[PDB]
Every structure is written in structure tokens, then in C-alpha cells.
Amino acid sequence: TNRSTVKISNVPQTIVADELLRFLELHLGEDTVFALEIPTTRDNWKPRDFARVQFTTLEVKSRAQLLSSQSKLLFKTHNLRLSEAYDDIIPRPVDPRKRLDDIVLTVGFPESDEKRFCALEKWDGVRCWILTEKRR
Amino acid sequence: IIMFEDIFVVDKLDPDGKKFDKVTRVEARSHNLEMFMHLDVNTEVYPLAVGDKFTLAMAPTLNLDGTPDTLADKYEYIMHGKLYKISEKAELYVSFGGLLMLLQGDPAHISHFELDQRLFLLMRKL
Amino acid sequence: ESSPTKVFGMDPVTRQVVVVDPEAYTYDEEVIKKAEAMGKPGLIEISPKDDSF
């Protein structure tokens, strides 16, 4: 429950990422899959037997786990088994509230003894992400 | 007449397929006795999904009070085979006409089984 | 449209498939294969009848 990425146990070797994405979006909610990565032994022409899928919301992950536990996921006569992953595909917080976009960032130091602050360089339109799990 | 009888719950399937048109090997772990089992089953004629609970029984003969070599009405997946390897937590190797079975449990649980004998396999999915 | 012959029909008033002229199936495992490909293993079950000819 700490992360949102779910590792699929077995997938067909002949499928592509687009087909799996379409299947997941059909069974689950629309556009509820953020990242889908299929590891390849070779450079670009030999995918492995498993894949890792990142979901946008933990509710979608729980629903997918519930569906997998009931063996209701059947994609090309293969029963998809869902298991927890080790690391996230992309270090992105699950909570949309922590995601801050188009904000003003400035640096400085307490130059004066009173309640005064000095600005050296100011950046606009920066992205701020707060990762509670990674403590950064 | 029944030697071994316990409730088994499946854990995973070797093919993990629904319409593979191939014999599927199941891995079921016993309740209480905690005995791991390997069994080849045909999903097309006898469907078995993950998480289902089924009972298992083994008897030397299907007749009542002897007559080796009427329990048919109770169970629904009767099989016939022989035990060829007993060496191991002792385990049994019974082949039902080429369908291998591996019942791995405890030495005390499996003690009344002889080598090179005919035994049946009674199953029911509740 | 997956069936080689006209063995299944579509009913506009009910928006569901119907069976019309079941004697022209020709035992071509095409509709069953399409159903399996779509993801429904037990959608349509067709078996020959032993005592009817």
C-alpha cells in the first residue's frame, strides 16, 4: 500500500504495451493507468514474461487487486496475477494535492536581523513534488 | 475404507490459462495438516479456479467392506492409479495413467501406504 | 460477421443476437474462435447431436 506500481506475473509474449493498456482501461476506469513498462531481455525485440504497471490512484490499485484475486482478468486466455513491486516506475506522488505546478521559486537567506528576506534569483513556472515515502 | 481425507485449497496454476487446451497442473495446500499437493487436472471438463476449496479422498477400492480390485455417487472426479515412488517430510508419487501426482506432507500423516499398489482418487469441489 | 455462413442473426428490436437456420453452421470453428479472441471463453457453446441426423 506504500506504492502504487503493481507487477503483473505472466503476460503473453506476443502482446505490446498498447494492447495491455487498452485492456486495463477497458476493465478498469478510463485513462486510469499512468505508466506501463514491459522489460526486454534484448534491446527492442524480446520482451520478458512479466510487466509492471503504475496506477494513478490507490483506489484503482485496490480494485485491480480485488479483480485479480477473483481471477476476473482474462487477457488472451491468460490469467493476469497482480503482485507488489519493489520501486516505482516514475517518482510521482499518488496524492494530486501534493503536486504543485506553475509556482514561483526564489532563493535567499535571512539577510537582515529583522523580519526581512533577500531574493537573489527568482524562477517562475516550476514544478514541486512532495514524496512522503521517499522523505524528499 | 478411506485412508487419507482432508480439505485442500488451491494456490496457483501452472499454465494460468482458461482455454489452453492442455492439461493443467494445480498446487493446493492442505488445511490443518498443511500438506502440499501437485496434481494434473483437465480444466475444460472439470473447471477449477484459484481460491476454490475441494475435498480429497483416497481408498484402495470403491466397494464397501472389502472386495479390492459404492462411493461413485458421493464424489465426481474419481481416478485410478498406482504408487511407484515413495522416497522423499515424506512424499508420494502416484500416476493416474500418466497424470503425475505429488502429495508432500508429514511422515506421520502418510504411513499406511505400500509400494506398487492400486489406489483411487476421490475429489469433490464442495 | 465472423461466421462464414448465415447461422446467427441480429434482432434490432432487442439489440441481441438470435439463432436463425441452425442447420447451416457447417461445424466451422470460427465464431467460437472469435469469441475466445474477444475474451469470452464460454460465450457460445456448440456441440453436435448424436441421435439426430
PDB file of C-alpha atoms in Angstrom:
ATOM      1  CA  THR A   1       0.000   0.000   0.000  1.00  0.00           C
ATOM      2  CA  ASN A   2       3.074   2.219   0.289  1.00  0.00           C
ATOM      3  CA  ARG A   3       3.458   2.469  -3.503  1.00  0.00           C
ATOM      4  CA  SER A   4       1.119   2.408  -6.497  1.00  0.00           C
ATOM      5  CA  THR A   5       3.003   0.241  -9.015  1.00  0.00           C
ATOM      6  CA  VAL A   6       1.711  -3.315  -9.444  1.00  0.00           C
ATOM      7  CA  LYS A   7       3.776  -6.075 -11.057  1.00  0.00           C
ATOM      8  CA  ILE A   8       1.882  -8.437 -13.359  1.00  0.00           C
ATOM      9  CA  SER A   9       3.090 -12.024 -13.044  1.00  0.00           C
ATOM     10  CA  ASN A  10       2.501 -13.523 -16.503  1.00  0.00           C
ATOM     11  CA  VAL A  11       1.633 -11.807 -19.789  1.00  0.00           C
ATOM     12  CA  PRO A  12       1.660 -13.215 -23.348  1.00  0.00           C
ATOM     13  CA  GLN A  13       4.926 -12.758 -25.223  1.00  0.00           C
ATOM     14  CA  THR A  14       3.203 -11.617 -28.439  1.00  0.00           C
ATOM     15  CA  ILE A  15       1.403  -8.590 -26.961  1.00  0.00           C
ATOM     16  CA  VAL A  16       2.517  -4.956 -26.973  1.00  0.00           C
ATOM     17  CA  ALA A  17       2.181  -2.285 -24.295  1.00  0.00           C
ATOM     18  CA  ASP A  18      -0.681  -0.617 -26.183  1.00  0.00           C
ATOM     19  CA  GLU A  19      -2.820  -3.772 -26.098  1.00  0.00           C
ATOM     20  CA  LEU A  20      -2.302  -4.216 -22.352  1.00  0.00           C
ATOM     21  CA  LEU A  21      -3.066  -0.531 -21.767  1.00  0.00           C
ATOM     22  CA  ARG A  22      -6.299  -0.832 -23.759  1.00  0.00           C
ATOM     23  CA  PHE A  23      -7.286  -3.977 -21.848  1.00  0.00           C
ATOM     24  CA  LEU A  24      -6.643  -2.302 -18.486  1.00  0.00           C
ATOM     25  CA  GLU A  25      -8.556   0.833 -19.496  1.00  0.00           C
ATOM     26  CA  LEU A  26     -11.465  -1.319 -20.689  1.00  0.00           C
ATOM     27  CA  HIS A  27     -11.660  -3.387 -17.498  1.00  0.00           C
ATOM     28  CA  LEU A  28     -10.784  -0.527 -15.133  1.00  0.00           C
ATOM     29  CA  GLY A  29     -11.672   3.150 -15.413  1.00  0.00           C
ATOM     30  CA  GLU A  30     -10.798   5.225 -18.448  1.00  0.00           C
ATOM     31  CA  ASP A  31      -7.243   6.625 -18.505  1.00  0.00           C
ATOM     32  CA  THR A  32      -6.534   5.260 -15.017  1.00  0.00           C
ATOM     33  CA  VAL A  33      -3.109   3.838 -15.979  1.00  0.00           C
ATOM     34  CA  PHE A  34      -0.164   6.234 -15.723  1.00  0.00           C
ATOM     35  CA  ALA A  35       2.917   4.180 -16.651  1.00  0.00           C
ATOM     36  CA  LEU A  36       3.243   0.751 -18.264  1.00  0.00           C
ATOM     37  CA  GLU A  37       6.673  -0.814 -18.792  1.00  0.00           C
ATOM     38  CA  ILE A  38       7.478  -4.262 -20.196  1.00  0.00           C
ATOM     39  CA  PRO A  39      11.122  -5.283 -19.592  1.00  0.00           C
ATOM     40  CA  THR A  40      13.007  -6.664 -22.587  1.00  0.00           C
ATOM     41  CA  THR A  41      15.962  -9.050 -22.496  1.00  0.00           C
ATOM     42  CA  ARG A  42      17.171  -7.735 -25.861  1.00  0.00           C
ATOM     43  CA  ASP A  43      17.155  -4.075 -26.904  1.00  0.00           C
ATOM     44  CA  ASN A  44      13.727  -3.750 -28.534  1.00  0.00           C
ATOM     45  CA  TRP A  45      12.581  -7.170 -29.798  1.00  0.00           C
ATOM     46  CA  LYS A  46      12.400  -9.641 -26.864  1.00  0.00           C
ATOM     47  CA  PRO A  47      10.048  -8.703 -24.017  1.00  0.00           C
ATOM     48  CA  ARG A  48      10.069 -10.662 -20.780  1.00  0.00           C
ATOM     49  CA  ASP A  49       7.259 -12.718 -19.242  1.00  0.00           C
ATOM     50  CA  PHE A  50       6.231 -10.059 -16.689  1.00  0.00           C
ATOM     51  CA  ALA A  51       5.381  -6.361 -16.705  1.00  0.00           C
ATOM     52  CA  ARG A  52       4.973  -3.525 -14.207  1.00  0.00           C
ATOM     53  CA  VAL A  53       2.015  -1.123 -14.285  1.00  0.00           C
ATOM     54  CA  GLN A  54       1.655   2.146 -12.357  1.00  0.00           C
ATOM     55  CA  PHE A  55      -1.811   3.386 -11.398  1.00  0.00           C
ATOM     56  CA  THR A  56      -2.867   6.979 -10.792  1.00  0.00           C
ATOM     57  CA  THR A  57      -4.994   6.389  -7.673  1.00  0.00           C
ATOM     58  CA  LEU A  58      -4.668   3.839  -4.874  1.00  0.00           C
ATOM     59  CA  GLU A  59      -8.384   3.084  -5.251  1.00  0.00           C
ATOM     60  CA  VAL A  60      -7.727   1.852  -8.796  1.00  0.00           C
ATOM     61  CA  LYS A  61      -4.886  -0.300  -7.457  1.00  0.00           C
ATOM     62  CA  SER A  62      -7.158  -1.804  -4.795  1.00  0.00           C
ATOM     63  CA  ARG A  63      -9.872  -2.508  -7.373  1.00  0.00           C
ATOM     64  CA  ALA A  64      -7.328  -4.161  -9.678  1.00  0.00           C
ATOM     65  CA  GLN A  65      -6.045  -6.297  -6.796  1.00  0.00           C
ATOM     66  CA  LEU A  66      -9.611  -7.326  -5.942  1.00  0.00           C
ATOM     67  CA  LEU A  67     -10.283  -8.263  -9.572  1.00  0.00           C
ATOM     68  CA  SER A  68      -7.040 -10.255  -9.775  1.00  0.00           C
ATOM     69  CA  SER A  69      -7.810 -12.122  -6.543  1.00  0.00           C
ATOM     70  CA  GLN A  70     -11.133 -13.224  -8.069  1.00  0.00           C
ATOM     71  CA  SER A  71      -9.443 -14.239 -11.366  1.00  0.00           C
ATOM     72  CA  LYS A  72     -11.685 -11.854 -13.317  1.00  0.00           C
ATOM     73  CA  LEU A  73      -8.815 -10.566 -15.502  1.00  0.00           C
ATOM     74  CA  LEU A  74      -8.500 -12.668 -18.670  1.00  0.00           C
ATOM     75  CA  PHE A  75      -6.422 -11.172 -21.500  1.00  0.00           C
ATOM     76  CA  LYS A  76      -5.758 -13.538 -24.426  1.00  0.00           C
ATOM     77  CA  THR A  77      -6.537 -16.748 -22.477  1.00  0.00           C
ATOM     78  CA  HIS A  78      -4.044 -15.692 -19.785  1.00  0.00           C
ATOM     79  CA  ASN A  79      -4.978 -15.093 -16.143  1.00  0.00           C
ATOM     80  CA  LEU A  80      -3.183 -11.938 -15.014  1.00  0.00           C
ATOM     81  CA  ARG A  81      -1.781 -12.193 -11.483  1.00  0.00           C
ATOM     82  CA  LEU A  82      -1.023  -8.953  -9.635  1.00  0.00           C
ATOM     83  CA  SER A  83       1.774  -8.586  -7.082  1.00  0.00           C
ATOM     84  CA  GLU A  84       3.515  -5.712  -5.334  1.00  0.00           C
ATOM     85  CA  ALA A  85       6.541  -4.087  -6.961  1.00  0.00           C
ATOM     86  CA  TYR A  86       9.873  -3.013  -5.488  1.00  0.00           C
ATOM     87  CA  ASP A  87      10.243   0.512  -6.905  1.00  0.00           C
ATOM     88  CA  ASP A  88       8.020   2.975  -8.733  1.00  0.00           C
ATOM     89  CA  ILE A  89       8.433   3.453 -12.475  1.00  0.00           C
ATOM     90  CA  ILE A  90       8.317   7.241 -12.023  1.00  0.00           C
ATOM     91  CA  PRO A  91       8.879   9.020  -8.677  1.00  0.00           C
ATOM     92  CA  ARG A  92       5.493  10.761  -8.687  1.00  0.00           C
ATOM     93  CA  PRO A  93       3.320  11.206  -5.570  1.00  0.00           C
ATOM     94  CA  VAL A  94      -0.061   9.494  -5.599  1.00  0.00           C
ATOM     95  CA  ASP A  95      -1.856  12.426  -3.959  1.00  0.00           C
ATOM     96  CA  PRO A  96      -2.752  15.088  -6.569  1.00  0.00           C
ATOM     97  CA  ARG A  97      -2.796  17.750  -3.832  1.00  0.00           C
ATOM     98  CA  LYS A  98       0.955  17.489  -3.211  1.00  0.00           C
ATOM     99  CA  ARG A  99       1.610  18.147  -6.917  1.00  0.00           C
ATOM    100  CA  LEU A 100       2.236  21.878  -7.398  1.00  0.00           C
ATOM    101  CA  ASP A 101       2.512  23.207 -10.956  1.00  0.00           C
ATOM    102  CA  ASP A 102       3.350  26.710 -12.218  1.00  0.00           C
ATOM    103  CA  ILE A 103       4.576  28.216  -8.950  1.00  0.00           C
ATOM    104  CA  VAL A 104       7.227  30.825  -8.165  1.00  0.00           C
ATOM    105  CA  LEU A 105      10.527  29.652  -6.664  1.00  0.00           C
ATOM    106  CA  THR A 106      13.114  32.007  -5.172  1.00  0.00           C
ATOM    107  CA  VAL A 107      16.247  31.598  -3.065  1.00  0.00           C
ATOM    108  CA  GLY A 108      17.910  33.745  -0.438  1.00  0.00           C
ATOM    109  CA  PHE A 109      18.932  33.995   3.199  1.00  0.00           C
ATOM    110  CA  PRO A 110      17.939  35.950   6.329  1.00  0.00           C
ATOM    111  CA  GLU A 111      19.981  38.986   5.316  1.00  0.00           C
ATOM    112  CA  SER A 112      18.597  41.315   7.999  1.00  0.00           C
ATOM    113  CA  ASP A 113      18.157  40.760  11.722  1.00  0.00           C
ATOM    114  CA  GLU A 114      14.502  41.825  11.475  1.00  0.00           C
ATOM    115  CA  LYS A 115      11.730  40.048   9.535  1.00  0.00           C
ATOM    116  CA  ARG A 116      13.326  40.725   6.154  1.00  0.00           C
ATOM    117  CA  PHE A 117      14.302  38.424   3.294  1.00  0.00           C
ATOM    118  CA  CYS A 118      16.528  38.930   0.256  1.00  0.00           C
ATOM    119  CA  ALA A 119      15.865  37.465  -3.196  1.00  0.00           C
ATOM    120  CA  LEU A 120      18.843  36.628  -5.414  1.00  0.00           C
ATOM    121  CA  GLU A 121      17.327  34.784  -8.394  1.00  0.00           C
ATOM    122  CA  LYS A 122      13.641  34.045  -8.986  1.00  0.00           C
ATOM    123  CA  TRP A 123      12.279  31.201 -11.121  1.00  0.00           C
ATOM    124  CA  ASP A 124       8.713  31.023 -12.435  1.00  0.00           C
ATOM    125  CA  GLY A 125       6.607  28.070 -13.532  1.00  0.00           C
ATOM    126  CA  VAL A 126       8.483  25.432 -11.538  1.00  0.00           C
ATOM    127  CA  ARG A 127       7.110  22.031 -10.520  1.00  0.00           C
ATOM    128  CA  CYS A 128       7.176  20.932  -6.872  1.00  0.00           C
ATOM    129  CA  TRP A 129       6.569  17.323  -5.812  1.00  0.00           C
ATOM    130  CA  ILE A 130       6.448  16.147  -2.190  1.00  0.00           C
ATOM    131  CA  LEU A 131       7.379  12.484  -1.666  1.00  0.00           C
ATOM    132  CA  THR A 132       6.407  11.352   1.830  1.00  0.00           C
ATOM    133  CA  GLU A 133       7.568   7.767   1.252  1.00  0.00           C
ATOM    134  CA  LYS A 134      10.971   8.835  -0.094  1.00  0.00           C
ATOM    135  CA  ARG A 135      11.307  11.613   2.535  1.00  0.00           C
ATOM    136  CA  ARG A 136      12.424  14.105  -0.115  1.00  0.00           C
TER     137      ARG A 136
ATOM    138  CA  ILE B   1     -12.152 -47.549   3.647  1.00  0.00           C
ATOM    139  CA  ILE B   2     -10.754 -44.045   3.144  1.00  0.00           C
ATOM    140  CA  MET B   3      -7.077 -43.788   4.087  1.00  0.00           C
ATOM    141  CA  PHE B   4      -6.372 -40.069   3.585  1.00  0.00           C
ATOM    142  CA  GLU B   5      -9.061 -37.371   3.563  1.00  0.00           C
ATOM    143  CA  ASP B   6      -8.583 -33.623   4.047  1.00  0.00           C
ATOM    144  CA  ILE B   7      -9.762 -30.252   2.735  1.00  0.00           C
ATOM    145  CA  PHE B   8      -7.463 -28.696   0.131  1.00  0.00           C
ATOM    146  CA  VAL B   9      -7.336 -25.108  -1.149  1.00  0.00           C
ATOM    147  CA  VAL B  10      -5.655 -24.320  -4.467  1.00  0.00           C
ATOM    148  CA  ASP B  11      -2.856 -21.737  -4.522  1.00  0.00           C
ATOM    149  CA  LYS B  12      -1.712 -21.329  -8.137  1.00  0.00           C
ATOM    150  CA  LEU B  13      -1.986 -22.919 -11.577  1.00  0.00           C
ATOM    151  CA  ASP B  14       0.989 -23.903 -13.720  1.00  0.00           C
ATOM    152  CA  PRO B  15      -0.467 -22.700 -17.082  1.00  0.00           C
ATOM    153  CA  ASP B  16      -2.672 -19.970 -15.569  1.00  0.00           C
ATOM    154  CA  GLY B  17      -4.908 -20.238 -18.621  1.00  0.00           C
ATOM    155  CA  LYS B  18      -8.600 -20.746 -19.296  1.00  0.00           C
ATOM    156  CA  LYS B  19      -8.691 -22.177 -22.848  1.00  0.00           C
ATOM    157  CA  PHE B  20      -5.158 -23.511 -23.312  1.00  0.00           C
ATOM    158  CA  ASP B  21      -6.481 -26.943 -24.418  1.00  0.00           C
ATOM    159  CA  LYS B  22      -3.772 -28.554 -22.281  1.00  0.00           C
ATOM    160  CA  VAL B  23      -3.630 -30.474 -19.012  1.00  0.00           C
ATOM    161  CA  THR B  24      -3.194 -28.066 -16.094  1.00  0.00           C
ATOM    162  CA  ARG B  25      -1.101 -28.788 -13.003  1.00  0.00           C
ATOM    163  CA  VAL B  26      -2.505 -27.346  -9.775  1.00  0.00           C
ATOM    164  CA  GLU B  27      -0.791 -26.529  -6.486  1.00  0.00           C
ATOM    165  CA  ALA B  28      -3.095 -26.966  -3.480  1.00  0.00           C
ATOM    166  CA  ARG B  29      -2.110 -26.655   0.175  1.00  0.00           C
ATOM    167  CA  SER B  30      -3.979 -28.736   2.770  1.00  0.00           C
ATOM    168  CA  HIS B  31      -5.811 -27.151   5.689  1.00  0.00           C
ATOM    169  CA  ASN B  32      -4.756 -28.163   9.219  1.00  0.00           C
ATOM    170  CA  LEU B  33      -2.459 -30.941   8.003  1.00  0.00           C
ATOM    171  CA  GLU B  34      -0.632 -28.406   5.767  1.00  0.00           C
ATOM    172  CA  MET B  35       0.386 -30.846   3.024  1.00  0.00           C
ATOM    173  CA  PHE B  36       1.472 -29.552  -0.386  1.00  0.00           C
ATOM    174  CA  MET B  37      -0.020 -31.300  -3.414  1.00  0.00           C
ATOM    175  CA  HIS B  38       0.730 -31.438  -7.136  1.00  0.00           C
ATOM    176  CA  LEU B  39      -1.992 -32.759  -9.429  1.00  0.00           C
ATOM    177  CA  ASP B  40      -2.682 -32.674 -13.165  1.00  0.00           C
ATOM    178  CA  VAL B  41      -6.328 -31.818 -13.868  1.00  0.00           C
ATOM    179  CA  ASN B  42      -8.316 -31.092 -17.032  1.00  0.00           C
ATOM    180  CA  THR B  43      -9.895 -27.650 -16.684  1.00  0.00           C
ATOM    181  CA  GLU B  44     -12.155 -27.985 -19.739  1.00  0.00           C
ATOM    182  CA  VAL B  45     -14.169 -30.862 -18.266  1.00  0.00           C
ATOM    183  CA  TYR B  46     -13.578 -30.081 -14.555  1.00  0.00           C
ATOM    184  CA  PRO B  47     -13.172 -26.316 -14.067  1.00  0.00           C
ATOM    185  CA  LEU B  48     -11.071 -25.222 -11.093  1.00  0.00           C
ATOM    186  CA  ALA B  49     -10.380 -21.580 -10.240  1.00  0.00           C
ATOM    187  CA  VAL B  50      -7.888 -20.091  -7.800  1.00  0.00           C
ATOM    188  CA  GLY B  51      -9.168 -19.839  -4.235  1.00  0.00           C
ATOM    189  CA  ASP B  52     -11.684 -22.674  -4.563  1.00  0.00           C
ATOM    190  CA  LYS B  53     -11.967 -25.298  -1.825  1.00  0.00           C
ATOM    191  CA  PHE B  54     -12.281 -29.007  -2.600  1.00  0.00           C
ATOM    192  CA  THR B  55     -12.093 -32.233  -0.612  1.00  0.00           C
ATOM    193  CA  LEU B  56      -9.858 -35.176  -1.475  1.00  0.00           C
ATOM    194  CA  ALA B  57     -10.087 -38.845  -0.508  1.00  0.00           C
ATOM    195  CA  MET B  58      -8.039 -41.953  -1.285  1.00  0.00           C
ATOM    196  CA  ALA B  59      -9.344 -45.513  -1.000  1.00  0.00           C
ATOM    197  CA  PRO B  60      -7.840 -48.830  -2.151  1.00  0.00           C
ATOM    198  CA  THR B  61     -11.236 -49.906  -3.525  1.00  0.00           C
ATOM    199  CA  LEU B  62     -14.546 -48.222  -4.305  1.00  0.00           C
ATOM    200  CA  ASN B  63     -16.567 -51.111  -2.846  1.00  0.00           C
ATOM    201  CA  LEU B  64     -17.822 -51.285   0.739  1.00  0.00           C
ATOM    202  CA  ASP B  65     -16.075 -53.520   3.296  1.00  0.00           C
ATOM    203  CA  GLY B  66     -13.516 -55.235   1.095  1.00  0.00           C
ATOM    204  CA  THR B  67     -13.751 -56.535  -2.476  1.00  0.00           C
ATOM    205  CA  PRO B  68     -10.491 -54.904  -3.638  1.00  0.00           C
ATOM    206  CA  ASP B  69      -9.897 -54.554  -7.379  1.00  0.00           C
ATOM    207  CA  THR B  70     -20.372 -47.621  -3.938  1.00  0.00           C
ATOM    208  CA  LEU B  71     -18.611 -44.272  -3.485  1.00  0.00           C
ATOM    209  CA  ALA B  72     -19.285 -43.087  -7.050  1.00  0.00           C
ATOM    210  CA  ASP B  73     -22.451 -41.200  -6.077  1.00  0.00           C
ATOM    211  CA  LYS B  74     -20.621 -39.092  -3.473  1.00  0.00           C
ATOM    212  CA  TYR B  75     -17.630 -37.773  -5.439  1.00  0.00           C
ATOM    213  CA  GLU B  76     -17.388 -36.569  -9.034  1.00  0.00           C
ATOM    214  CA  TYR B  77     -13.706 -36.784 -10.110  1.00  0.00           C
ATOM    215  CA  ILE B  78     -12.772 -40.399  -9.401  1.00  0.00           C
ATOM    216  CA  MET B  79      -9.414 -41.541 -10.788  1.00  0.00           C
ATOM    217  CA  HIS B  80      -7.363 -44.735 -10.649  1.00  0.00           C
ATOM    218  CA  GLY B  81      -3.604 -45.078 -10.416  1.00  0.00           C
ATOM    219  CA  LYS B  82      -0.632 -46.678  -8.702  1.00  0.00           C
ATOM    220  CA  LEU B  83       2.147 -45.545  -6.368  1.00  0.00           C
ATOM    221  CA  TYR B  84       5.603 -46.143  -7.849  1.00  0.00           C
ATOM    222  CA  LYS B  85       7.949 -43.914  -5.809  1.00  0.00           C
ATOM    223  CA  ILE B  86       7.721 -43.357  -2.051  1.00  0.00           C
ATOM    224  CA  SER B  87      11.148 -41.906  -1.190  1.00  0.00           C
ATOM    225  CA  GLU B  88      11.137 -38.279  -0.054  1.00  0.00           C
ATOM    226  CA  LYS B  89       8.560 -34.831   5.070  1.00  0.00           C
ATOM    227  CA  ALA B  90       7.652 -37.934   3.077  1.00  0.00           C
ATOM    228  CA  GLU B  91       6.062 -37.537  -0.352  1.00  0.00           C
ATOM    229  CA  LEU B  92       4.095 -39.797  -2.689  1.00  0.00           C
ATOM    230  CA  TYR B  93       4.345 -40.186  -6.472  1.00  0.00           C
ATOM    231  CA  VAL B  94       1.115 -41.594  -7.940  1.00  0.00           C
ATOM    232  CA  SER B  95       0.477 -41.598 -11.695  1.00  0.00           C
ATOM    233  CA  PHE B  96      -3.127 -41.873 -12.914  1.00  0.00           C
ATOM    234  CA  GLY B  97      -2.389 -43.187 -16.386  1.00  0.00           C
ATOM    235  CA  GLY B  98       0.395 -40.672 -16.971  1.00  0.00           C
ATOM    236  CA  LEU B  99      -1.096 -37.896 -14.809  1.00  0.00           C
ATOM    237  CA  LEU B 100       1.516 -37.473 -12.088  1.00  0.00           C
ATOM    238  CA  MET B 101       0.547 -36.591  -8.521  1.00  0.00           C
ATOM    239  CA  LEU B 102       2.916 -35.346  -5.807  1.00  0.00           C
ATOM    240  CA  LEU B 103       1.478 -35.368  -2.269  1.00  0.00           C
ATOM    241  CA  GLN B 104       4.138 -33.918   0.044  1.00  0.00           C
ATOM    242  CA  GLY B 105       3.226 -33.810   3.727  1.00  0.00           C
ATOM    243  CA  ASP B 106       4.478 -35.171   7.048  1.00  0.00           C
ATOM    244  CA  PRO B 107       5.984 -38.616   7.744  1.00  0.00           C
ATOM    245  CA  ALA B 108       3.352 -39.374  10.395  1.00  0.00           C
ATOM    246  CA  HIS B 109       0.415 -38.396   8.168  1.00  0.00           C
ATOM    247  CA  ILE B 110       1.418 -40.836   5.404  1.00  0.00           C
ATOM    248  CA  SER B 111       2.295 -44.192   6.971  1.00  0.00           C
ATOM    249  CA  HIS B 112      -0.271 -46.762   5.724  1.00  0.00           C
ATOM    250  CA  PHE B 113       0.660 -46.655   2.019  1.00  0.00           C
ATOM    251  CA  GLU B 114       2.554 -49.557   0.448  1.00  0.00           C
ATOM    252  CA  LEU B 115       4.734 -49.549  -2.653  1.00  0.00           C
ATOM    253  CA  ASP B 116       3.304 -50.675  -6.009  1.00  0.00           C
ATOM    254  CA  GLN B 117      -0.367 -50.716  -5.022  1.00  0.00           C
ATOM    255  CA  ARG B 118      -3.557 -49.560  -6.728  1.00  0.00           C
ATOM    256  CA  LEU B 119      -5.405 -46.646  -5.130  1.00  0.00           C
ATOM    257  CA  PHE B 120      -8.246 -44.358  -6.182  1.00  0.00           C
ATOM    258  CA  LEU B 121      -8.588 -40.569  -6.033  1.00  0.00           C
ATOM    259  CA  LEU B 122     -11.927 -39.185  -4.823  1.00  0.00           C
ATOM    260  CA  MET B 123     -12.487 -35.446  -5.246  1.00  0.00           C
ATOM    261  CA  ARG B 124     -15.376 -33.026  -4.793  1.00  0.00           C
ATOM    262  CA  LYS B 125     -15.415 -29.225  -5.025  1.00  0.00           C
ATOM    263  CA  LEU B 126     -17.940 -28.847  -2.185  1.00  0.00           C
TER     264      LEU B 126
ATOM    265  CA  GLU C   1     -19.746 -11.161 -39.348  1.00  0.00           C
ATOM    266  CA  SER C   2     -17.196 -13.714 -38.094  1.00  0.00           C
ATOM    267  CA  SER C   3     -19.419 -16.661 -39.039  1.00  0.00           C
ATOM    268  CA  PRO C   4     -18.650 -17.939 -42.569  1.00  0.00           C
ATOM    269  CA  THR C   5     -22.336 -18.796 -43.088  1.00  0.00           C
ATOM    270  CA  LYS C   6     -25.592 -17.104 -42.084  1.00  0.00           C
ATOM    271  CA  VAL C   7     -26.232 -19.014 -38.866  1.00  0.00           C
ATOM    272  CA  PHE C   8     -26.532 -16.137 -36.349  1.00  0.00           C
ATOM    273  CA  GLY C   9     -28.883 -13.186 -36.694  1.00  0.00           C
ATOM    274  CA  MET C  10     -29.231  -9.749 -35.135  1.00  0.00           C
ATOM    275  CA  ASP C  11     -32.551  -8.545 -33.730  1.00  0.00           C
ATOM    276  CA  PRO C  12     -32.879  -4.733 -33.931  1.00  0.00           C
ATOM    277  CA  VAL C  13     -35.817  -4.554 -31.506  1.00  0.00           C
ATOM    278  CA  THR C  14     -33.913  -6.353 -28.719  1.00  0.00           C
ATOM    279  CA  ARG C  15     -30.286  -5.465 -29.616  1.00  0.00           C
ATOM    280  CA  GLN C  16     -29.208  -9.075 -29.061  1.00  0.00           C
ATOM    281  CA  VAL C  17     -28.087 -11.970 -31.236  1.00  0.00           C
ATOM    282  CA  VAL C  18     -30.509 -14.732 -32.229  1.00  0.00           C
ATOM    283  CA  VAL C  19     -30.160 -18.170 -33.810  1.00  0.00           C
ATOM    284  CA  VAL C  20     -31.658 -18.438 -37.304  1.00  0.00           C
ATOM    285  CA  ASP C  21     -31.263 -21.502 -39.552  1.00  0.00           C
ATOM    286  CA  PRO C  22     -29.050 -23.566 -37.200  1.00  0.00           C
ATOM    287  CA  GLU C  23     -28.587 -26.288 -39.848  1.00  0.00           C
ATOM    288  CA  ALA C  24     -26.096 -24.189 -41.867  1.00  0.00           C
ATOM    289  CA  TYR C  25     -23.343 -23.982 -39.240  1.00  0.00           C
ATOM    290  CA  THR C  26     -21.098 -26.401 -41.217  1.00  0.00           C
ATOM    291  CA  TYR C  27     -19.107 -27.065 -37.998  1.00  0.00           C
ATOM    292  CA  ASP C  28     -16.619 -24.290 -38.805  1.00  0.00           C
ATOM    293  CA  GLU C  29     -14.956 -23.238 -35.534  1.00  0.00           C
ATOM    294  CA  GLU C  30     -14.878 -19.555 -36.474  1.00  0.00           C
ATOM    295  CA  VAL C  31     -17.448 -17.928 -34.175  1.00  0.00           C
ATOM    296  CA  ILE C  32     -16.047 -19.827 -31.178  1.00  0.00           C
ATOM    297  CA  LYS C  33     -12.510 -18.728 -32.063  1.00  0.00           C
ATOM    298  CA  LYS C  34     -13.674 -15.117 -32.388  1.00  0.00           C
ATOM    299  CA  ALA C  35     -15.414 -15.321 -29.003  1.00  0.00           C
ATOM    300  CA  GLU C  36     -12.235 -16.718 -27.437  1.00  0.00           C
ATOM    301  CA  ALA C  37     -10.188 -13.925 -29.027  1.00  0.00           C
ATOM    302  CA  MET C  38     -12.574 -11.253 -27.724  1.00  0.00           C
ATOM    303  CA  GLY C  39     -12.074 -12.621 -24.199  1.00  0.00           C
ATOM    304  CA  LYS C  40     -15.258 -14.656 -23.623  1.00  0.00           C
ATOM    305  CA  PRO C  41     -14.472 -18.389 -23.321  1.00  0.00           C
ATOM    306  CA  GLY C  42     -17.987 -19.589 -22.505  1.00  0.00           C
ATOM    307  CA  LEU C  43     -19.985 -17.220 -24.697  1.00  0.00           C
ATOM    308  CA  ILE C  44     -21.317 -19.633 -27.343  1.00  0.00           C
ATOM    309  CA  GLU C  45     -21.217 -23.416 -26.887  1.00  0.00           C
ATOM    310  CA  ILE C  46     -21.991 -25.566 -29.938  1.00  0.00           C
ATOM    311  CA  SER C  47     -21.982 -29.365 -29.821  1.00  0.00           C
ATOM    312  CA  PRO C  48     -23.149 -31.966 -32.354  1.00  0.00           C
ATOM    313  CA  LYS C  49     -26.210 -34.080 -31.597  1.00  0.00           C
ATOM    314  CA  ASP C  50     -25.541 -37.819 -31.732  1.00  0.00           C
ATOM    315  CA  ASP C  51     -29.122 -39.095 -32.131  1.00  0.00           C
ATOM    316  CA  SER C  52     -30.277 -36.583 -34.779  1.00  0.00           C
ATOM    317  CA  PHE C  53     -29.398 -36.579 -38.477  1.00  0.00           C
TER     318      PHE C  53
END
